[PDB]
Structure formats: structure tokens, C-alpha cells
Amino acid sequence: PKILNKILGKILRLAAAFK
Structure with missing residues (x-):
């Protein structure tokens, strides 16, 4: 799913x- 980069992107x- 939303990996660290995604969370980071958030x-x-x-x-x-x-x-």
C-alpha cells in the first residue's frame, strides 16, 4: 500500500x- 514515500509525500x- 502507501509506503513511506507516500506517507512522506503526504x-x-x-x-x-x-x-
Whole structure:
């Protein structure tokens, strides 16, 4: 399923909101 990269990608997605 969603591996680390995906979860990481999820963070990046939110990180975009934070950044």
C-alpha cells in the first residue's frame, strides 16, 4: 500500500500548506 514515500509525500503535501 502507501509506503513511506507516500506517507512522506503526504507530509510534503501538508508541508506545502505549512511552508
